[PDB]
């Protein structure tokens, strides 16, 4: 559960370049032999994505911010990648989305899971029936409050260690849209020595997860190796195969999706990448002819918002009213009309010079930004037990017989010792 790996070593988050990845179908709508323009959370082309790899003395399982969405890409031989953990705290404090492929089927669950230092899945002691079926469940210790569960079709996962170049390529897309989580996937063989292949790919939806939870961080799960001959301390002495997984960030960008006769995308263009791409976006075409075209308009954004209001002087003496030598009786309460002046309420409400202060129908903060039509001040002195009677819809010796506030009273009551 919480046992740290012996050979794990931290490495700096090195970066790389992505050529044409980050493209996926925004919706199930079908289109063919057309160039469609759409804006959604996308990974910009030629962007920077993290450089992570798994070996027997550097194990990569860092916590990465999710933000509005991320992109995944990895080159595999034995499919070392196991799954992911999605959530805000990645702990039982809140719900976390987790996807685990434990060699029989893809399992998606939304519950309150207990966080672990190094969550993952592995297998041990295979011997003469290759197996590679999930053995231990370190992903989480306990679960509760499950609001969603899903199961995919059964299948067998091949974790055989293979020599040569990387024969497999897996790329997924993870995004949140008003709490709606969408998953895209793509699988294609490759012959790769290092880094990523030069080419284009299109990712298709995997499942639909209308969950509706806030996710700000996520983890990448890895599959390690175990054997009868070279085991280790539980569970620090376990090792995993060779793999490299890369994580990107999605941004609200507009792409020109070029659809073939069968509807598959063969090309993509990002407006913000290249001014030539800006020309293509403006023309809504994948070909640009020799010439000068107007794509958009440039503008200089304000540095900061500057407010210069006129002098607020000539204030009516509210302080004198509150500090006047004498006040009228509760029955003889004076009705003071205030107009033809400015009111500075910052010194009154926020000075904390009075015992109690409350407002009805409007918060004191909003009153500072509002312009009124008529303002009246009613000054009176009453006993402590009678202060509670000053409110809309009250009764008593003061509320009914001396001074009554209407149920729709939008003013405020001020009192002090």
């Amino acid at each position, epitope marked *: *559960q919480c046992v740290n790996l012996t050979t794990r070593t931290q490495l700096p988050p090195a970066y790389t370049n992505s050529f044409t990845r980050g493209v996926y179908y925004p919706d199930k709508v079908f289109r063919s032999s057309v160039l469609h323009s759409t804006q959604d959370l996308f990974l910009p082309f030629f962007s920077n994505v993290t450089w992570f790899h798994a070996i027997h003395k550097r194990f990569d399982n860092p916590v990465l911010p999710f933000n509005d969405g991320v992109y995944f890409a990895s080159t595999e031989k034995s499919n070392i990648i196991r799954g992911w953990i999605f959530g805000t705290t990645l702990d039982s404090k809140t719900q976390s989305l987790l996807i685990v492929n434990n060699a029989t089927n893809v399992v998606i669950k939304v519950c309150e899971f207990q966080f672990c230092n190094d969550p993952f899945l592995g297998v*041990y*002691y295979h011997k*003469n029936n290759k197996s590679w079926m999930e053995s231990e*469940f370190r992903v989480y210790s306990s679960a509760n409050n499950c609001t969603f569960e899903y199961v995919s079709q059964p299948f067998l996962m091949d974790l055989e260690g293979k020599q040569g170049n990387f024969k497999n390529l897996r790329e997924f897309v993870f995004k949140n849209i008003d709490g709606y989580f969408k998953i895209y996937s793509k699988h294609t063989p490759i012959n790769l020595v290092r880094d990523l292949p030069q080419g284009f790919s299109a990712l298709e939806p995997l499942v639909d997860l209308p969950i509706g939870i806030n996710i700000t961080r996520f983890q990448t799960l890895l599959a390690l190796h175990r054997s*009868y*001959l070279t085991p280790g301390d539980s*569970s620090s002495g376990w090792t995993a195969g060779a793999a490299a997984y890369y994580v990107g960030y999605l941004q609200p960008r507009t792409f020109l999706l070029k659809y073939n006769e069968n509807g598959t995308i063969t090309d993509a263009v990002d407006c913000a990448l290249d001014p030539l791409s800006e020309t293509k976006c403006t023309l809504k075409s994948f070909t640009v002819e020799k010439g000068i075209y107007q794509t958009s308009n440039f503008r200089v954004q304000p540095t900061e918002s500057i407010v210069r209001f006129p002098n607020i002087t000539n204030l009516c003496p509210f302080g004198e009213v509150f500090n006047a030598t004498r006040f009228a009786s509760v029955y003889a309460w004076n009705r003071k009309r205030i107009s033809n002046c400015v009111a500075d309420y910052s010194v009154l409400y926020n000075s904390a010079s009075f015992s109690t202060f409350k407002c009805y129908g409007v918060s004191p903060t909003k009153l500072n930004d509002l312009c009124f039509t008529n303002v009246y001040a009613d000054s009176f002195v009453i006993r402590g037990d009678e202060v509670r009677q000053i409110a809309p819809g009250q009764t008593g010796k003061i509320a009914d017989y001396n001074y009554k506030l209407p149920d729709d009273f939008t003013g405020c009551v001020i009192a002090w010792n």
Partner: antibody
Amino acid sequence: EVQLLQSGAELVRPGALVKLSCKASGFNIKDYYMHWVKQRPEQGLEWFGWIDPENGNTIYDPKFQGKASITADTSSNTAYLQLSSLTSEDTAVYYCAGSGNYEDAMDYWGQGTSVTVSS
Amino acid sequence: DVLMTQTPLSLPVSLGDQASISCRSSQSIVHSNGNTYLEWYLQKPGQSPKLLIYKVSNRFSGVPDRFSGSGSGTDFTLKISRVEAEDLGVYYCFQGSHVPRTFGGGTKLEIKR
């Protein structure tokens, strides 16, 4: 020195259940597997199952499948065994082994417990 | 489920003689890496079984150097260089790794006279 401690003997009626404890001393219960074994005089030992306190996964002898459940305690450093729906055929001596460190080359055994199921 | 058989049921050996106990398995327990999965247990009178050998080729810590195993495939034999008075008991064979573990029929040892 490590030692595995178990109850000396136990006696229950048919159809009842027995709760057995195997104490861990001198080693970490979480990081080491725990095994169980049953012995009878006629044909010797019979395997029962294994459990990992860190994980909790359990496998049972096809004969005992559905007949028992295994549990372990972390704080107490003691592994528990439970048998249900006991019958006359369940009379035997039980043993526990562990301290594997994910390796076969390392294991011990306790003095065992004598369990008799009769009326 | 793997079935294991042992023979002979018992054998006498005078002090200083060599003892041979063999075990048979219904399925191969050797794999690609070349090592073997088997453990030898000895149960002394009034005492529980204790490990003797692991992998058939490596001796368990604290065990006398007289105890050693050898073999290949599904056929193996436990060899004791010099049997002493403390070797009385029953010898067992164990199938390890990740599979329903199997036990042997048992082999008893006694001193000759």
